[PDB]
Design a protein around this ligand. Structure first.
Ligand code: AR6
Length: 265
């Protein structure tokens, strides 16, 4: 936790100063790309995403979100979109306190916090709503520079991805006071909107994963099935993306989140 906290603070310094020093000693400028990502950030309300919905190579890997994004970005020039397994309440989650989950890693490693912190309306909505189902609001962050690897080392050459920030329902907080089917309906509607936003912004390659299945306590079989219903068996997004990676990095014994996705896809 202390090392993660230090890295988070360094990233905030980097985002203020507009440059960082790579391990070779190269000084890498990022201010322009960070500013572009912030200025291009958009909040989508639930009903705007619903309007989009009126209008494939599938891999399951043990990669982190960022590792999969980096791999894809090296292989072709179209910008990849990645799902941020978002906090509804804090931009970058607990990253500055050294918390360890997917969003925090994204915030430690990229310009994502600079984008998310600029959308206070998203966070205010959820704070006032006080319901752990959260909502279908989504933040779209284009061209966010990524400048660390999985170990926290700064990159000689940063790369850019789009982020899609949408919180899964907090099933852990709900317990059994919503049914399996109610949670499934919420997951399906929201995931459909995430995919619609990605496609609307021209992203043909996605990095998805076990959204909601760690800190938020969702069932990975249900989340894998949610994506499967959208992408397979003639579902609404069947054939609409070129490449979808379920990058599932699960350090728990048995890697159960990864196993559920491997089984389904
Ligand atoms: N870097 C990663 N890359 C890919 N998969 C990962 C990674 N880290 C974890 N996983 C796997 O993917 C699963 C889900 O990762 P989780 O980060 O718990 O997402 P949530 O949507 O349930 O929790 C969101 C909250 O956690 C944050 O604090 C936020 O700010 C929110 O407050 C894990 O169980 C792992 O199997």
């Amino acid at each position: 936790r202390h090392s993660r906290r230090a890295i988070a603070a360094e990233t905030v310094e980097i985002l203020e100063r507009g440059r960082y020093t790579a391990p070779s000693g190269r000084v890498v400028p990022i201010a322009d790309h960070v500013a572009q990502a912030v200025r291009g950030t958009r909040l989508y309300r639930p009903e705007k995403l619903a309007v989009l919905l009126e209008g494939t190579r599938i891999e399951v890997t043990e990669e982190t979100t960022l590792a999969a994004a980096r791999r894809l970005t090296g292989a072709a020039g179209d910008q990849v979109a990645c799902l941020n397994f978002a906090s509804a309440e804090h931009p970058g989650g607990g990253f500055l306190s050294g918390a360890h989950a997917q969003e925090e890693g994204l915030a430690r490693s990229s310009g994502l916090y600079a984008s998310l912190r600029a959308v206070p309306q998203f966070y205010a909505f959820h704070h006032r709503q006080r319901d752990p189902l959260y909502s279908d609001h989504l933040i779209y962050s284009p061209g966010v520079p990524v400048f660390r690897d999985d170990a926290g080392r700064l990159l000689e050459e940063p790369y850019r991805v789009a982020f899609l920030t949408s919180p899964a329902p907090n099933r852990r907080a709900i317990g059994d006071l919503r049914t399996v089917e109610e949670i499934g309906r919420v997951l399906r509607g929201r995931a459909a909107k995430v995919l619609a936003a990605a496609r609307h912004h021209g992203h043909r390659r996605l990095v998805l994963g076990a959204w909601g299945c760690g800190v938020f306590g969702n069932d990975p079989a249900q989340v894998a099935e949610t994506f499967a219903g959208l992408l397979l068996d003639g579902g609404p997004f069947a054939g609409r993306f070129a490449h979808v990676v379920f990058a599932v990095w699960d350090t728990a014994p048995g890697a159960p989140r990864h196993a559920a996705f491997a089984r389904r896809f």
